[PDB]
């Protein structure tokens, strides 16, 4: 019951961080550049049943680009990512779109403006209009704050299943079951938790 999703955009825009957050819930602080592509299954539970995205997280750095447009072959949907604190990333959005739609002629695509958590935004709301003529859905997002993080997938799923009333639903919770750990616990207590200045 699965769909190939290609994820494209300039290096540093937060593609891989965005996926990881969806995969495991973690926020990866470090920038480790993707090498070619990284494929990752990602399931969502919906009122129309479960939907499976096979996420192809591609490299943004030219030098690490691997097969490039080769990755887009038979993609069924896409996400174009930019960084609202980096104007050049937005400038490049038409280049990523061009390369993408040349291979994938008729697919639903979300434009995403990442890193809106950052105080000093550079790509103004007002400027973001590229999506209009190209029939892309647009969302301000933050992989760090989780602001609108679910939106691209909810939309894509509505489009691909052909049901605008599709919702994410709660996966039924099966009843859970009923000594080196002492060393391991200590290490954990004494390792500080990140972002202690967050609201949660």
């Amino acid at each position: 019951v699965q769909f190939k999703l290609v994820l494209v955009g300039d290096g540093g825009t937060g593609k891989t961080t965005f996926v990881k957050r969806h995969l495991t819930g973690e926020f990866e602080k470090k920038y480790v550049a993707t090498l070619g592509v990284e494929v990752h299954p990602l399931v969502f539970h919906t009122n129309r049943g479960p939907i499976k995205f096979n996420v192809w997280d591609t490299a943004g750095q030219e030098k690490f680009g691997g097969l490039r447009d080769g990755y887009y072959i038979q993609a069924q949907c896409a996400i174009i990512m930019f960084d609202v604190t980096s104007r050049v990333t937005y400038k490049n959005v038409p280049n990523w779109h061009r390369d993408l739609v040349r291979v994938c002629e008729n697919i639903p695509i979300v434009l995403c403006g990442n890193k809106v958590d950052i105080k000093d935004r550079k790509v103004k709301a007002k400027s973001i209009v590229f999506h209009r003529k190209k029939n892309l859905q647009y969302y301000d997002i933050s992989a760090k704050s989780n602001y609108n993080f679910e939106k691209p997938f909810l939309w894509l799923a509505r489009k691909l299943i052909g049901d605008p009333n599709l919702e994410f639903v709660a996966m039924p919770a099966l009843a859970p079951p009923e000594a080196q750990y002492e060393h391991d616990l200590e290490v954990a207590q004494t390792t500080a938790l990140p972002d202690e200045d967050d609201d949660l």
């Binding site: 470090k30 080769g70 000093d120 103004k124 859905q137 602001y147």
Partner: protein
């Protein structure tokens, strides 16, 4: 494993094995897909890999294999084409053309392998960019001829032309030199007449797939082609009628027609005007008859999302808004065109009702455009009276939540404080306000009537809902300013009376929260009213004070924000003694501050205090102001005084509860200082010396704790708490100095003890224990009084320069705050107190230069930008010194370092964001030599005697470039430097030459004459 064999080139390529590996990557999963992926990437990267292409195309049974083959060629063509022997060029061209021909003739292939054919076409187009027309003159005539023989070939040819037009006109700026872009554009222009003829014929002789392809090509042509091709042919009729009727062609046609609505068009041509009318008229007629009438529920349709309905409605919105924005005046004067004008707008109305935010923004942009024109252009607004009336309704009923309204409804049906700011609706609200404001002005009676009566339908309960009262309330607040004071007066009265009624009736905590949020929003939006109605104002503020005791956290928080929002505009009325009042209201607020703020969180308490400070600064009598300040600070100052005793008796504020108290005291001071600025000074005086003592004590605690517990201690709540004290102290001083009017006192009283308290502490702490805020504080200090304290500037540098540099020079990521503040500090010092750098020992001055170049290697814009600016300012600073030994020695030591380092980041493709300022800096450095502003030889007798710096610079640069980019020819390099040097006074030309160089370094065989572009 088995798969790795394709990487061994000494053996023949096992095609079957290739296909397995490709299949494994595309259709596999897990570890095997990953391995396959790596193999294919390696294969692809092999610079001989292209030699295998023909073979793969021939014997492969796997389309993805062939795709990858083509990507390999593409890379070859785009980067090393001219490096190849002539035979290999022809050979590649032939099997590419041949493949395309062959795939187009087999119907099944043509039908089922569209991706491969497309990839093939693009690959051809790449060959053209290199070879066409100079070495392929007949390609267009042969393309045209071939088209007549087959529907498949013809259709494919359109794909090729589309791609060509894209590559040449739409995407060439970043990918080609100015000269090459001009060459290809010209070439396409010179042959378009025949291209168009083919395009037109096909469109008249109406195969749908062919027609669609042809139309897609047209969309691209429309970007650049002369207008006469559009207007002096029958093509407009075809697009606006024939191609609108069938849905297979409608989408593209509409997009073509949108582009047409943007063509280059004579303003005084009656006939062309007529045609621009006709195509609109036709198009709207087809919509009405073939798609949906003007009365249709587009909101419903969109929401159902059948077929391609959403994209169609999107494209329609785009068509209508683009056209009308440009041409609506053509429909405004002729009576016979009125219906059409209004119908067009009625469609837009219907479109505006759709629940899609991005789409709504598109239409909202148009409305704004309309209304702004109706506001100024005479005899126009009456035409649109009905449209506008309907529009008022749409907007009022779709007002998005203002940033100020802190309550929202949860999934459980509960009205609660928002978790986060709805950052994505800020701009939407503004835009909605703007349009609505304009609409109100256009007809104030209608707007008021709509609102008053909607509000009535809430009271009596007929239309009552949270959504409905909210949107209304928001709309009401948003039109503040639109009315005359007098009308506004009456208007506001009616509204408040009703909201008050509504409050009385709608009980329960959820309802109450909603009605509260809305009343606060409205009242905060109408200060003018408030200023005129003291009794009312007073009663509002007291009610806000009650809300400060609300258990409902949303209401409470909003009460604080509204209080300050109100004060920000009405502060004057709080500071004077009102008629029939015993005291100025500020007195009353201060007296009862402990009560009022009892249930507030500290940050809210601070906001409250900040607000009071705004009021107090209205009092311009010094004696009376200082007295109010004193009164306001009474509680924090007494808490303070008692702590200063206990603390000085025994440094063991180890108690965490005391730590929070201290922090909040200082935070309160910060809050008041922020609003009072220069007026804060007497209060600053009360606490200053003890504050700096406290800074010292806390600093010792932190260090003691680190010593006793290790670096981990810095993560503990205790130590974080202690640092907060230090940070807030630094903040208070920063805030005050940034606003100070009396600089003499800052220097004489504030600065020496500050420096004494903070510099050595920063210097002598371990890296992890150092506050970036010190750097930030120091920047403000240098910024404001740096000129007056040259020795102090020295002291700052000595204390923070090297030790900070050593923190941030191992990588680009660690200590990100320090990094940013460090370069802001150096920036301001370089600007305001350059002498401080002159006094540095040579070793340190070298580090400074290093520090600068390290800055522009950051991708981090915050660091990068300051890096470049410093470099530029530094050069200016040196230049300004004139022919003196320091300036001389500087150039001898560092000129080329700056030149080379700037070139490096220009050329590495990892610093694209800094291009402009990089260019500027480079231009300055070159111009310095070009203008003989360097008194000494930049060489040493490594070159002949009396050799100009001009001649040497070129030599240095050629050699540098030659070695850095060995694939370039000597003439390419020479040509490039000639252009660049000659152009060192014209930044825009100079930048163009730089860009041209960036293109040429990515390929082989770049034409040196390209640098003659002019």
């Amino acid at each position: 494993g088995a798969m790795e064999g394709i990487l061994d080139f000494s053996n023949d390529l096992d095609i079957a094995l290739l296909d397995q590996v490709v299949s494994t990557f595309y259709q596999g999963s897990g570890v095997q897909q990953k391995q396959a992926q790596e193999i294919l990437t390696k294969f692809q990267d092999n610079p001989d890999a292209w030699q295998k292409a023909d073979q793969i195309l021939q014997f492969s049974t796997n389309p993805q294999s062939k795709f990858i083959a083509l990507s390999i060629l593409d890379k070859l063509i785009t980067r090393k084409w001219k490096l190849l022997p002539n035979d290999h060029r022809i050979g590649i061209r032939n099997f590419v053309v041949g493949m395309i021909i062959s795939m187009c003739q087999d119907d099944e292939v043509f039908k089922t392998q569209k991706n491969l054919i497309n990839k093939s076409d693009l690959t051809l187009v790449q060959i053209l960019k290199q070879e066409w027309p100079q070495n392929w003159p007949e390609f267009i005539p042969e393309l045209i001829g071939s088209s007549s023989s087959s529907v498949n070939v013809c259709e494919n040819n359109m794909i090729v032309l589309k791609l060509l037009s894209e590559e040449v006109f739409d995407f060439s700026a970043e990918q080609m030199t100015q000269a090459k872009a001009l060459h290809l554009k010209n070439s396409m222009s010179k042959e378009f007449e025949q291209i168009f003829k083919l395009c037109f014929q096909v469109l008249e002789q109406g195969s749908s797939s062919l027609i669609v392809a042809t139309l897609e090509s047209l969309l691209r042509y429309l970007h650049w082609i002369p207008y006469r091709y559009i207007y002096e042919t029958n093509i407009l009729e075809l697009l606006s009628t024939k191609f609108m009727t069938s849905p297979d062609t409608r989408a593209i046609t509409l997009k073509c027609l949108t582009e047409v609505s943007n063509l280059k068009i004579p303003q005084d041509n009656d006939l062309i005007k007529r045609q621009t009318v006709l195509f609109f008229q036709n198009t709207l007629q087809q919509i009405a008859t073939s798609v949906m009438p003007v009365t249709a529920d587009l909101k419903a349709t969109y929401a159902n999302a059948n077929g391609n309905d959403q994209s169609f409605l999107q494209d329609l919105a785009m068509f209508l808004t683009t056209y009308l924005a440009r041409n609506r005046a053509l429909l405004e004067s002729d009576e016979s065109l009125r219906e059409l004008l209004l119908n067009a707008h009625q469609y837009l109305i219907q479109l505006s009702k759709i629940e899609e935010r991005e789409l709504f923004k598109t239409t909202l942009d148009y409305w704004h455009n309309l209304v702004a024109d109706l506001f100024y252009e005479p005899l126009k607004k009456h035409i649109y009276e009905e449209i506008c009336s309907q529009l008022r309704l749409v907007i009022i009923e779709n007002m998005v939540r203002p940033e100020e309204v802190l309550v929202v409804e949860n999934d459980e049906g509960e009205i609660v404080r928002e978790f986060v700011k709805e950052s994505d609706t800020i701009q939407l609200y503004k835009s909605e306000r703007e349009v609505l404001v304009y609409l109100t002005h256009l007809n104030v009676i209608d707007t008021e009537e709509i609102m008053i009566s909607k509000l009535a339908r809430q009271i009596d309960g007929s239309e009552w809902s949270w959504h409905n009262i909210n949107t209304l309330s928001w709309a009401i607040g948003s039109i503040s300013g639109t009315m005359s004071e007098d009308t506004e007066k009456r208007f506001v009265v009616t509204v408040i009376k009703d909201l008050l009624d509504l409050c009385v009736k709608k009980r329960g905590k959820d309802n109450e929260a909603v009605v509260a949020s809305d009343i606060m929003y409205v009242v905060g939006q109408y200060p003018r009213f408030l200023k005129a109605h003291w009794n009312f104002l007073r009663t509002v503020i007291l009610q806000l004070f009650e809300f400060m005791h609300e258990t409902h956290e949303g209401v409470q928080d909003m009460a604080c924000d509204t209080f300050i929002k109100i004060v920000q505009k009405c502060k004057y009325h709080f500071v004077i003694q009102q008629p029939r009042e015993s005291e100025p209201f500020i007195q009353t607020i201060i007296r009862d501050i402990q009560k009022t703020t009892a249930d507030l969180q500290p940050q809210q308490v601070h906001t409250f205090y900040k607000a009071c400070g705004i009021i107090i600064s209205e009092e311009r009598s010094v004696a009376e102001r200082n007295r109010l300040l004193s009164d306001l600070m009474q509680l924090p100052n007494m808490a303070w005084d008692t702590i200063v005793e206990q603390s000085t008796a025994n440094p063991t504020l180890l108690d965490s509860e005391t730590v929070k108290i201290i922090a909040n005291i200082i935070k309160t001071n910060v809050a008041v200082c922020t609003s009072m600025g220069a007026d804060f000074y007497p209060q600053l005086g009360h606490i200053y010396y003890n504050m700096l003592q406290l800074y010292r004590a806390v600093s010792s605690m932190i260090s003691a704790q680190v010593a006793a517990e290790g670096l981990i201690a810095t993560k503990t709540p205790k130590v974080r708490g202690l640092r907060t004290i230090k940070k807030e102290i630094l903040k208070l001083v920063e805030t005050y100095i940034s606003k100070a009017r009396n600089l003499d006192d800052v220097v004489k009283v504030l600065v020496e003890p500050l420096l004494n308290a903070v510099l050595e502490d920063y210097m002598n702490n371990v890296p992890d224990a150092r506050d970036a805020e010190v750097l930030n504080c120091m920047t403000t200090v240098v910024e404001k009084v740096g000129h007056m304290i040259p020795q102090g500037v020295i002291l700052i540098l000595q204390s923070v320069f090297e030790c900070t540099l050593d923190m941030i020079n191992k990588d680009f990521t660690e200590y990100p705050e320090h990094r940013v503040e460090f370069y802001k500090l150096l920036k301001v010092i370089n600007e305001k107190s350059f002498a401080a750098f002159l006094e540095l020992p040579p070793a340190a001055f070298k580090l400074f230069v290093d520090a600068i170049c390290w800055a522009f290697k950051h991708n981090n814009r915050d660091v990068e930008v300051n890096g470049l600016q410093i470099a530029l300012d530094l050069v200016k600073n040196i230049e300004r010194m004139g022919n003196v030994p320091f300036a001389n020695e500087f150039h001898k030591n560092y000129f080329f370092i700056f030149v080379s380092e700037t070139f490096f980041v220009l050329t590495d493709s990892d610093h694209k964001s800094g291009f402009s300022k990089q260019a500027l800096l480079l231009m300055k450095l070159i111009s310095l030599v070009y203008d003989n502003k360097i008194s000494v030889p930049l060489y040493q007798a490594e070159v002949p005697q009396g050799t100009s710096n001009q001649v040497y610079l070129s030599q240095y640069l050629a050699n540098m470039l030659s070695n850095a980019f060995p694939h370039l020819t000597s003439e390419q390099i020479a040509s490039f430097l000639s252009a660049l040097t000659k152009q060192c006074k014209d930044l825009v030309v100079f930048k163009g030459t730089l860009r041209d160089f960036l293109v040429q370094i990515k390929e082989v065989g770049g034409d040196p004459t390209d640098y003659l572009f002019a």
